[PDB]
Design a protein around this ligand. Structure first.
Ligand SMILES: *CCC(=O)NCCCCNC(=O)O[C@H]1[C@@H](O)[C@H](n2cnc3c(=O)nc(N)[nH]c32)O[C@@H]1COP(=O)(O)OP(=O)(O)O
Length: 170
């Protein structure tokens, strides 16, 4: 009838985790800190014919090694690993987030998608083939997004749902 999916968004400060969440759930964007994140946690949508409830867990505001972040990683069925294409440090941080999920889950088979956000901005510092190479070594897809123009937003979240379905189907 309906299927629920627990999706967790991780990544460094200001990469756009919350803006991506609000765009998906509310079809809304503002170029400032957006307090409507407090009301943006579930989207009901049909994906490939199936009525799906997407519950989005946003790690924004959590310390790097907090107990609530650990709970988020235990609960999540799939993870968006977000960096910003104009922030080199946020791309270098991706290894840490991947390792933290793998250790908390005690598994090497966790559904994940690598997301390069802020693709609408000029003067990038992270090149696509750098991210494509990383995603290949993880065995996961890579998707370029903009929370502002909505580029790739449905692609990123629905691709993660499809990865979860493949995992559940053995
Ligand atoms: C964030 C650090 C900083 O000082 N930025 C300078 C502006 C400060 C106020 N503006 C702001 O915080 O904007 C948000 C968001 O609107 C913007 N953002 C997010 N995604 C995109 C995008 O795809 N394209 C463009 N042009 N802007 C985008 O970045 C900041 C932070 O976004 P967030 O979701 O709050 O970040 P977090 O990962 O949840 O911490």
């Amino acid at each position: 009838h309906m299927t629920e999916y627990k999706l967790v968004v991780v990544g460094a400060g200001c990469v756009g985790k919350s803006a991506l969440t609000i765009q998906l759930i509310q079809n809304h964007f503002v170029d400032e800190y957006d307090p409507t994140i407090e009301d943006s946690y579930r989207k009901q949508v049909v994906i490939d014919g199936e009525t799906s409830l997407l519950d989005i867990l946003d790690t924004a505001g959590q310390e790097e090694y907090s107990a609530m972040r650990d709970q988020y990683m235990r609960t999540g069925e799939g993870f968006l690993l977000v960096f910003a294409i104009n922030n080199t440090k946020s791309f270098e941080d991706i290894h840490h987030y991947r390792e933290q999920i793998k250790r908390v889950k005690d598994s090497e088979d966790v559904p994940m998608v690598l997301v390069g956000n802020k693709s609408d901005l000029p003067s990038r510092t992270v090149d696509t083939k750098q991210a494509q190479d990383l995603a290949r070594s993880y065995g996961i897809p890579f998707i370029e997004t903009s929370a502002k123009t909505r580029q790739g937003v449905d692609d990123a979240f629905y691709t993660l749902v499809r990865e979860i379905r493949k995992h559940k189907e053995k």
